Amino acid sequence: CYPGQPGCGHCSRPNYCEGARCESGFHDCGSDHWCDASGDRCCCA
């Protein structure tokens, strides 16, 4: 999602930034969550 889209926003713990892939303990939630850099997907534990 884009930085400011209707539904998306800055992720937060247990959500974090993940420009590659979430660790074996979190889940990719970049759907409605983006990172400071327009390209990184925010993960959620």
End-to-end CA distance of the chain: 19
Tokens, residue 2? 């884009």
| Structure-determination approach | NMR
* 3-class secondary structure, 28: strand
Tally of CB atoms within 10 A around 29: 17
Tokens, residue 44? 């959620």
